[PDB]
Design a protein around this ligand. Structure first.
Ligand SMILES: Cc1[nH]c(C(=O)Nc2nc3c(O[C@@H](C)c4ccccc4)cc(C(=O)O)cc3s2)c(Cl)c1Cl
Length: 183
C-alpha cells in the first residue's frame, strides 16, 4: 500500500510543491519520537538539516524492535516502515536509512521509495538505545526541495512548549545554526 501513497502523495502528506508537505515529512518522523518521549523512554530528540537538503531525526528511546514479526517474516522495524504513519515518509523518500540502537547492537535498513534494499542488518555495537531516520525526499514527488529553519524551528518551539520534559536539538548544517529547545 506504499504504491497508493506514491500514486496520490498530496492526499497523505500535503501539497508537494509549496513546501507544506516537504516539512510535514519531518513533522511526522518527529511525532514518532515524541510518542517515545510521552511513553517515558525518550528525553532527547535531534533534528538535522543536511547540506544536501536531507533530514536526520534521532531519539534516545527504546529503539524500534528488530525481532522477526511472525506474520510478515521480516523485522518489526521493516513492518513499521513499510506497512500502512512514518511509512508515508518512507514511501515519499527516494532514500531512507533507518539505524536502531537496541540491546547493545546497531541495526540498519535502507529503503528506496519505501522498498527495502536489504533486510534489517547488524552493523556495529553500542551502549546507547534509540532510533535514527535519515531521509532524502523523492524529487519525483516534491518540487523545490528546500527545508526552512523557520518552519522546523516553529514546530519544535510548539513541541517543546507542549512537552516541557523533552530536549529537542535543531541543527542546520547549511548555516551551522543550532538551538536546543527545552521549556
Ligand atoms: C524516529 C522514530 N522513533 C520511533 C520509535 O522509537 N518508536 C518505537 N516504537 C516502539 C515499539 O512499538 C512498535 C512495535 C510500534 C511502533 C509504531 C506502531 C506500532 C508499533 C515498541 C518498543 C518496545 O517494545 O521496546 C520500542 C519502540 S521504539 C519511530 Cl517509529 C520513529 Cl520513526
Amino acid at each position: 500500500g506504499l504504491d497508493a501513497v506514491r500514486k496520490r502523495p498530496g492526499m497523505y502528506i500535503g501539497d508537494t510543491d509549496d513546501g507544506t508537505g516537504l516539512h510535514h515529512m519531518v513533522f511526522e518522523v518527529v511525532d514518532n519520537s515524541i510518542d517515545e518521549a510521552l511513553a517515558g523512554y525518550c528525553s532527547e530528540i535531534s533534528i538535522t538539516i543536511h547540506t544536501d537538503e536531507s533530514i536526520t531525526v534521532r531519539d534516545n528511546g527504546r529503539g524500534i524492535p528488530v525481532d522477526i514479526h511472525k506474520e510478515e517474516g521480516v523485522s518489526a522495524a521493516e513492518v513499521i516502515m513499510t506497512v500502512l504513519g512514518v511509512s508515508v515518509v518512507n514511501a515519499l523518500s527516494h532514500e531512507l536509512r533507518l539505524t536502531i540502537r537496541r540491546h547493545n547492537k546497531v541495526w540498519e535498513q535502507v529503503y528506496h521509495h519505501g522498498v527495502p534494499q536489504f533486510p534489517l542488518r547488524e552493523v556495529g555495537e553500542t551502549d546507547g538505545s534509540g532510533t535514527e531516520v535519515h531521509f532524502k525526499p523523492s524529487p519525483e514527488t516534491f518540487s523545490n526541495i528546500h527545508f526552512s529553519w523557520d518552519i522546523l524551528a516553529k514546530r519544535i518551539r510548539e513541541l517543546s512548549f507542549l512537552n516541557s520534559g523533552v530536549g529537542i536539538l535543531l541543527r542546520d548544517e547549511r548555516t551551522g545554526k543550532e538551538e536546543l529547545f527545552k521549556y
